[PDB]
Amino acid sequence: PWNLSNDEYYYPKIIQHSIPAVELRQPFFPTHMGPIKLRQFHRPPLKKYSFGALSQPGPHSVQPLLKHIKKKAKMREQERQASGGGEMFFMRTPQDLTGKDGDLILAEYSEENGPLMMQVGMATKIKNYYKRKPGKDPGAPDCKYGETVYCHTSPFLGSLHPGQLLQAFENNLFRAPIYLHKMPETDFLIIRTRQGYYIRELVDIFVVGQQCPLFEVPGPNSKRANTHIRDFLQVFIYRLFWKSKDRPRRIRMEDIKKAFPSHSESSIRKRLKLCADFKRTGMDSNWWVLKSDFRLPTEEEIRAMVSPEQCCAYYSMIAAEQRLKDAGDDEVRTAPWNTTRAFIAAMKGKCLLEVTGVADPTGCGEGFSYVKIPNK
Amino acid sequence: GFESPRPYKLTHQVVCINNINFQRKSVVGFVELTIFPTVANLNRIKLNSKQCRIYRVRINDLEAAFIYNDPTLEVCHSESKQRNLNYFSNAYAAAVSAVDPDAGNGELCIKVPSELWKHVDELKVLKIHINFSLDQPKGGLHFVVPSVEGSMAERGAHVFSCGYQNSTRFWFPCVDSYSELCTWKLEFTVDAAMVAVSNGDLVETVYTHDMRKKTFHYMLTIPTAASNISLAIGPFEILVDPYMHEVTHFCLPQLLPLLKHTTSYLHEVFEFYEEILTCRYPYSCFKTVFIDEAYVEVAAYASMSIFSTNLLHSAMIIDETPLTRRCLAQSLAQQFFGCFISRMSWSDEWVLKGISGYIYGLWMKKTFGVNEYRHWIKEELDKIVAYELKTGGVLLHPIFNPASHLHFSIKHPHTLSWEYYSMFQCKAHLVMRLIENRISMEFMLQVFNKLLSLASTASSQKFQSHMWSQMLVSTSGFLKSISNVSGKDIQPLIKQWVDQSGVVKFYGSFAFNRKRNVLELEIKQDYTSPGTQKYVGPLKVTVQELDGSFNHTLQIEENSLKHDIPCHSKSRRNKKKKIPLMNGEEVDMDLSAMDADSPLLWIRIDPDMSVLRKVEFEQADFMWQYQLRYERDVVAQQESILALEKFPTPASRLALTDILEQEQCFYRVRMSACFCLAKIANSMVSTWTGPPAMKSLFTRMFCCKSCPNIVKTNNFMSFQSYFLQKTMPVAMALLRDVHNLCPKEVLTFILDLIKYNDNRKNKFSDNYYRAEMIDALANSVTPAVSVNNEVRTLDNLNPDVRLILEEITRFLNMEKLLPSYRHTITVSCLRAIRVLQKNGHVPSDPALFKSYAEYGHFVDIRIAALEAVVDYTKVDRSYEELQWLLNMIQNDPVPYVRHKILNMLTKNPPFTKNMESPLCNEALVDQLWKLMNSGTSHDWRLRCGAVDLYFTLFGLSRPSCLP
Amino acid sequence: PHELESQFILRLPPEYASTVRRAVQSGHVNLKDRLTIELHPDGRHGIVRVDRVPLASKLVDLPCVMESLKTIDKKTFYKTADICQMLVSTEKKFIWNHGITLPLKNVRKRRFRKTAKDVEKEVKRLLSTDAEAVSTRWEIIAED
């Protein structure tokens, strides 16, 4: 007639990326980054086109896109109201991730090179942490973006004041305090493609403070590092087998050698040894056909193999490897594998961090340094 | 997209009922349908009607000609000499498909008059006015008329619409499909002292000009199907809910306080179902009717539910509060997702049954706790793996035979066996739990809210089905809404567990490699059994080692056998530290039984029940004892209890005794540990040291400190030591000595529990505890030592059984003067007399049970007595008792009792197909073929029960015992 | 295939920024004729022509990294591109020291931690010259 389940003795007490991002598609998640592409990591230069309308030299008209924005927003609202009116998932194609539609905000970073950084196509949430005032409080100061949550226990290193609302980017990679600023009155946003220039205005720009890392960047030559390299190569090989139209699914080796050119071909053969065999003569000659007993994994198994946040941690590791390599122990402490290990260990309560040090990304008294100190 | 199989679209229907005569069991009325033809040259219009005598039919006030034929009255011809069951199943499927409104067909074929053809070609409205009469219905409307004199309201006579699925054709002519949605206008002219409850909201109640009768007018503006329209006419006591004011509860007279106490919880069920979904309750009223001689225990129609009065309990009745509470909860879940959102075909029924069962399981989780949820999910999963390994498998969403491994056709709900229907609903809600496991629970509730919101925007339009078909769900629409809200599609999971009809069997065994510190699992599947299929997905395994609990995902492809997972340290055996558990806590474990070289304490293959599986893991006995003691999962404690019966070592006795002594264990684990301890104690006789099992523990927990053999006076206010106290002597009576006789120390203990029982002090009743005491007395009966088939008389009675017989005589006679809540002691004493007759103690005479199986008794007494008569006619090979049971199947007033007799005669058959019996005549084959063909033509549940009985007795081929 | 879109920021003089802002928020294709952008084959020089009035432009590198984030419900935000360049209109000259927001000013000089031991390319050229040579003589020197 009651509960009668002794639950207090048995049980004592989210981010959905785009379908191009969870499928690790190669424009957004690169297979190989060279040295000049690792120096320009997250700072991509303005490339000159060889073919297209902008490749011909001369003046080029920019095109306003406000009929396009409101047409796409009205179309997405029709899709949402046709599907029952709830919240929908829209980012299903690469053409959904253009800047030509939707409400864009900008997000500037305080640090030069953060320990973790999102790739194109990945999602993040805005959480407004609001500590109520002692006793009576009016309610969270309302904010245009994000959802509000009442935080008794401060997520960040410091603690919120009573009656202080702090917005923050929250995802699987990090959690970082953001601060809404209005845009300058002179700056517009030009989206250039091969066909032409397009212009939006911006009105909202956030400044992102020092990140609190939630994912540990692996070290170089680590076991997690080599495991991610092997799993990424295996996922790419499976997706090339899925893309093959031949009835015995078959791939070519130099497609994989074009994608991963730093790999020795002994490792690629090792990945193809199980699940494929090489045909030298007859039909399918010089192709790696799929074995007939091998069941090619489904889409959800391939998604469960490698996560996009592991790819971001690997990209952070190899970019920091390049920067350290170019600059000939203080710098090694500022490497993201050390700082991410230090911060995550401090969050479990293993150890403490010297908050003033050399891992400080500001170079002055502002900002923290995530390097381990003993708790004694 | 929904395209109708009918060439017309029905907009509005008026059902008017006059002259409900209770003496003659007769109704008169008319029906006026408003159809719009969608195809020109409509000519014939085909409607559904059973048992109604059609007087006249007028189309647009012009007299029309109808022809009636029902092929399901006599399925095969009387002069065909076929006697195999596959012939009858194909003929019965063809007959039900010939009256199917889900095709274009129907039983009443009305011809459009000639002058209206220019009205039907350019598609304009047609108003069909049929007037009919039910002369003495054998189905549909059930008239409960008691034989007390007085007025019909003074004796308690009432009518209600009974049946399952599309059974509204049994009391008015309609389009009896779930896809023909229309608005409704319902008028019922009843006696002035009676009330007529139906679907919609009651717009008015006018008197007749003599003021002896009154007409109830109901209107239903939400477009429902004809199959969701119901009726309950009787002298009901009305009670408005004091919390929610659109909810009225109707009971039979003199049962108002029971109704007040019973239906006092329902507002919390309403609040739950409206806060997990975000839609409010779609109908404008809710009505709960409690009736006598009900068809099912709970039926749910549009804006109405019909329960039996046997659910009504008072405040002092426990062990019935959770059952009635969950019956109310599943009726409300079917109000949301069986009556508002309806079915597009007979396929896509798994969607609605799964959503109803899944949200009812979420209600059970919030109300009774996560542990009761896990126990319920495990018992449903064990039920389905037992049924699917027994006979073929349940196929959710078939494609039109798709399932030819089973003796009936799955194309229509009225050809399904009743056990298949029950397992269908069970598998549907477990597959919905699997879809929640793949796509998280908040996205699942968003799917359900999107379906409800499309239906409620659809429910307010007036367009005749341009938009009213958004209230009908399909499989493709459900999967598309899932893909809309989540971005993942579940098509491999749908392809495996819905379209394929099988469960998986796992045989696991491990070996610990000490050199490389790995755990080599060996998981092999039995995929060649008739009910099984092959699993190739991922599989979770949880290993508890000394460093904690770690989860691993294994990829079990077809050629896979050995899975090497890594193991952690054993440094919590170097120092005594606490070993951390599955939750955040940690405990002190006695590591003396563990191996020195292996760190791992226990292994669980598929802990979260994420597949439809049956696991057979080979651990060591100390690992099962550690899993029984220190696990924080009730299904793992239950499976360790189930696996400790094979290891009768005294460490397992210590493990189960420590579980029994332990409060803060879930109570249904201790109730299982009682029976496991009884089995282990029976297996280690000539080794057992002290007293019998659980006796000292019973005197420590439930008896006085100063008197060990006097039980404490009954205080049942804890509800967990009440259940454990009433289950411990029932398991204690299964103790046996070296001579295979129950010891006289346990029988004397049970008799002293019966004598010293004092219940004048608790606020709860004692009927279930005393009934369990009679069950414990019945468990102690061992077979008697008859010499030379000596007649069992009173002098050569066992000295043990004379005390038992005196006690059950005293209990049954005292029940005749001071009755229990639902005659629980009558049921227990009849069951115990059948136990004494099954052994050689009481003479094998069915006359007592034949007197308790008469019509005027309570239905629990009736089904207990009929169970005893079925067991007697199985053991004594009685011909006249089988003819008595078949006659009672043919003409009994209560149809639930007829269904239960067919069910019990299927479960405990008098003979199987392998047996040579004296009861294998051509006469019995002809009687059962006549019972399948004719005779059971009015119920759709007696006919499937007769098909099940013919399959159990004679098999799928030609009855062998025949020329 | 798909090519990642390349977004940059255009900074205009304030009166010309007001005319361009009014023409953007109006939304006609009249703005398309009025505003043109010609990028010179230097790669770091241009003209932006507002209402057919030429303005001199430089494509500069920004000290921080910005990211455009689109949304449909204003609760979940999807990263669309990385912005690192600005075509201000009116090498060391092509590097901007300040950030776009008001708190970030003199970020490169003050709020950026500097770690030090073009130069690599010069070393490669020196190695190539040594290879094309015959005899190489080297000495770490002193003041001379």
Swiss-Prot record, chain A:
It is linked to Dystonia 3, torsion, X-linked: An X-linked dystonia-parkinsonism disorder. Dystonia is defined by the presence of sustained involuntary muscle contractions, often leading to abnormal postures. DYT3 is characterized by severe progressive torsion dystonia followed by parkinsonism. It has a well-defined pathology of extensive neuronal loss and mosaic gliosis in the striatum (caudate nucleus and putamen) which appears to resemble that in Huntington disease. Intellectual developmental disorder, X-linked, syndromic 33: A syndrome characterized by intellectual deficit, delayed psychomotor development, delayed speech and language, and characteristic facial features. Belongs to the TAF1 family. Component of the TFIID basal transcription factor complex, composed of TATA-box-binding protein TBP, and a number of TBP-associated factors (TAFs), including TAF1, TAF2, TAF3, TAF4, TAF5, TAF6, TAF7, TAF8, TAF9, TAF10, TAF11, TAF12 and TAF13. Interacts with TAF7; the interaction is direct. TAF1, when part of the TFIID complex, interacts with C-terminus of TP53. Signal peptide: none annotated. It comes from the Eukaryota. It is found in: Nucleus. Phosphorylated by casein kinase II in vitro. This is Transcription initiation factor TFIID subunit 1. The Bromo domain mediates interaction with histones that have acetylated lysine residues at specific positions. The second domain also recognizes and binds histones that are butyrylated and crotonylated. Residues 1-376 are annotated as: Histone acetyltransferase (HAT).
UniProtKB/Swiss-Prot annotation, chain B:
Keywords: Disease variant, Intellectual disability, Nucleus, Phosphoprotein, Transcription, Transcription regulation. Expressed in all tissues tested. GO terms for molecular function: chromatin binding; RNA polymerase II general transcription initiation factor activity; transcription cis-regulatory region binding. The keyword Transcription regulation applies. It is found in: Nucleus. One of its GO terms (biological process) is positive regulation of transcription initiation by RNA polymerase II. One of its GO terms (cellular component) is transcription factor TFIID complex. Transmembrane segments: none annotated. Changing residue 168 to R: In NEDFCF; uncertain significance. It comes from the Eukaryota. The TFIID basal transcription factor complex plays a major role in the initiation of RNA polymerase II (Pol II)-dependent transcription. TFIID recognizes and binds promoters with or without a TATA box via its subunit TBP, a TATA-box-binding protein, and promotes assembly of the pre-initiation complex (PIC). The TFIID complex consists of TBP and TBP-associated factors (TAFs), including TAF1, TAF2, TAF3, TAF4, TAF5, TAF6, TAF7, TAF8, TAF9, TAF10, TAF11, TAF12 and TAF13. TAF2 forms a promoter DNA binding subcomplex of TFIID, together with TAF7 and TAF1. Belongs to the TAF2 family. Component of the TFIID basal transcription factor complex, composed of TATA-box-binding protein TBP, and a number of TBP-associated factors (TAFs), including TAF1, TAF2, TAF3, TAF4, TAF5, TAF6, TAF7, TAF8, TAF9, TAF10, TAF11, TAF12 and TAF13. Interacts with TAF2C1. Component of the TFTC-HAT complex. PubMed:9418870 was unable to show an association between TAF2 and TFIID. This is Transcription initiation factor TFIID subunit 2. The gene is TAF2. The chain holds residues 19 to 988 of 1199 of the full protein.
Swiss-Prot record, chain C:
The modification Phosphoserine is found at residue 128. Phosphorylated by CIITA. Ubiquitinated by TRIM26; leading to proteasomal degradation. Disulfide bonds: none annotated. It is found in: Nucleus. Ubiquitous. Belongs to the TAF7 family. Component of the TFIID basal transcription factor complex, composed of TATA-box-binding protein TBP, and a number of TBP-associated factors (TAFs), including TAF1, TAF2, TAF3, TAF4, TAF5, TAF6, TAF7, TAF8, TAF9, TAF10, TAF11, TAF12 and TAF13. Part of a TFIID-containing RNA polymerase II pre-initiation complex that is composed of TBP and at least GTF2A1, GTF2A2, GTF2E1, GTF2E2, GTF2F1, GTF2H2, GTF2H3, GTF2H4, GTF2H5, GTF2B, TCEA1, ERCC2, ERCC3, TAF1, TAF2, TAF3, TAF4, TAF5, TAF6, TAF7, TAF8, TAF9, TAF10, TAF11, TAF12 and TAF13. Interacts with TAF1; the interaction is direct. The TFIID basal transcription factor complex plays a major role in the initiation of RNA polymerase II (Pol II)-dependent transcription. TFIID recognizes and binds promoters with or without a TATA box via its subunit TBP, a TATA-box-binding protein, and promotes assembly of the pre-initiation complex (PIC). The TFIID complex consists of TBP and TBP-associated factors (TAFs), including TAF1, TAF2, TAF3, TAF4, TAF5, TAF6, TAF7, TAF8, TAF9, TAF10, TAF11, TAF12 and TAF13. TAF7 forms a promoter DNA binding subcomplex of TFIID, together with TAF1 and TAF2. Overexpression of TAF7 in HeLa cells inhibits cyclin D1 and cyclin A gene transcription and causes the cells to accumulate in early S phase. In contrast, depletion of TAF7 from TFIID complexes by siRNAs increases histone H3 acetylation at both cyclin promoters and stimulates cyclins CCND1 and CCNA gene transcription. This is Transcription initiation factor TFIID subunit 7. It comes from Homo sapiens.
